[PDB]
């Protein structure tokens, strides 16, 4: 249908630095696509973002009880949730599955894309490097970047432009917090 | 340089009367509250064995969200939302091996309002077996992200589409996948 829509959002964002040593809470009201009023714990009181949010900031800031709750919330809310959730979120680690294959079946000495597929991992932070005969290839790397699967895993495809010669060994090397030593998978250009 | 962010995100939408309450951790849904069943739904089952959340409290927040919407609606002189159509991408969960189970992911991104019709099509026909989905995930630009899933058995013989309808689109958007 064509009926106009009107949308409200509310977000409480707990931002964590250095474990829980530094915590910043951001509370935000959003009408349609515009944030109207916010509480930022680094500020300590509500502030209007747009003009429409002015009455709400003034009203809420007049109530001592609210302000005190909100100001302690980095402890009673953010640190608390981080703590109870820690084992299965912050500390979640799932090892990537790493597979290497040519994008297409091309003859030696012909241009090709060597695909390093790195899938099923958590968390997102990861390093994927390509080596040709033990040497790091910095150029010709075509990456999807980090892909969020929506199920608490990530994947990435890191492809190398190659002109492979007989006997060459190509290595995809993966560093990730789930393993104490780099994962490596090799592709060997056929000896012909 | 933050290490982590946890977000409690809620919305209410008129005239649809649709609400959502969810927790997000570094971009992934921890859980949401089912508005129909009024119960906490954990995105991964294991979470539920080790954590708890009172679904009732979310409903009370939703009531508040609805009230706030109606106030802002009037206050803005009934300024409606601008539709922002989704980007849609279909991919698999892992590299395809013919005749080995896998999962098609329909990745829907950067859209608002949070209402979409999503249909999986196999060879042009709707399929519902084993399908699942996330709720709407929040974005920093206040648009939404959403995932739909279709377990399938890869074959050279089938083609797939994720068919997505949104008010910001002129026509339904079919995003195609077949083995290559």
């Amino acid at each position: 249908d064509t009926r106009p829509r009107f949308l409200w959002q509310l977000k409480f964002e707990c931002h964590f630095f250095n474990g829980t040593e530094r915590v910043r809470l951001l509370e935000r009201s959003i009408y349609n696509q515009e944030e109207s009023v916010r509480f930022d714990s680094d500020v300590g009181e509500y502030r209007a973002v747009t003009e429409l949010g002015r009455p709400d900031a003034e009203y809420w800031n007049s109530q001592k009880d609210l302000l005190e709750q909100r100001r302690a919330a980095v402890d009673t809310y953010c640190r608390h949730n981080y703590g109870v959730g820690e084992s299965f979120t912050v500390q979640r680690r799932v090892e990537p599955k790493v597979t290497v294959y040519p994008s297409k079946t091309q003859p030696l000495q012909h241009h090709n894309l060597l695909v390093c597929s790195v899938s099923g991992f958590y968390p997102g932070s990861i390093e994927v490097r390509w080596f040709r005969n033990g040497q790091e290839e910095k150029a010709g790397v075509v990456s999807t970047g980090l892909i969020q699967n929506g199920d608490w895993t990530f994947q990435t495809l890191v492809m190398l432009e190659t002109v492979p010669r007989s006997g060459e060994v190509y290595t995809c090397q993966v560093e990730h917090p789930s393993v104490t030593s780099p994962l490596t998978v090799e592709w060997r250009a056929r000896s012909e | 340089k933050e290490e982590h962010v946890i977000i409690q995100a809620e919305f209410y939408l008129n005239p649809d009367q649709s609400g959502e309450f969810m927790f997000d951790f570094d971009g992934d849904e921890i859980f949401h509250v089912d508005m129909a069943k009024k119960e906490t739904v954990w995105r991964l089952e294991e979470f539920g064995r080790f954590a708890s959340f009172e679904a009732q409290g979310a409903l009370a927040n939703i009531a508040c969200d609805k009230a706030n919407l109606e106030i802002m609606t009037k206050r803005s002189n009934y300024t409606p939302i601008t539709n922002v159509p989704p980007e849609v991408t279909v991919l698999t969960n892992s590299p395809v091996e013919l005749r080995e189970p896998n999962v098609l992911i329909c990745f829907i991104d950067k859209f608002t309002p949070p209402v979409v019709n999503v249909t999986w099509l196999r060879n042009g026909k709707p399929v519902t077996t084993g399908v699942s989905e996330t709720v709407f995930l929040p974005r920093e630009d206040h648009l939404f992200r959403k995932f739909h899933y279709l377990p399938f058995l890869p074959s050279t013989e089938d083609v797939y589409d994720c068919r997505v309808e949104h008010w910001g689109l002129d026509e339904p958007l079919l995003k195609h996948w077949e083995f290559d």
Partner: peptide, 12 residues
């Protein structure tokens, strides 16, 4: 996990 309560907007 605990929630933060939604605050009702000013009504003028």
């Amino acid at each position: 996990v605990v929630k933060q309560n939604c605050l009702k907007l000013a009504t003028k």
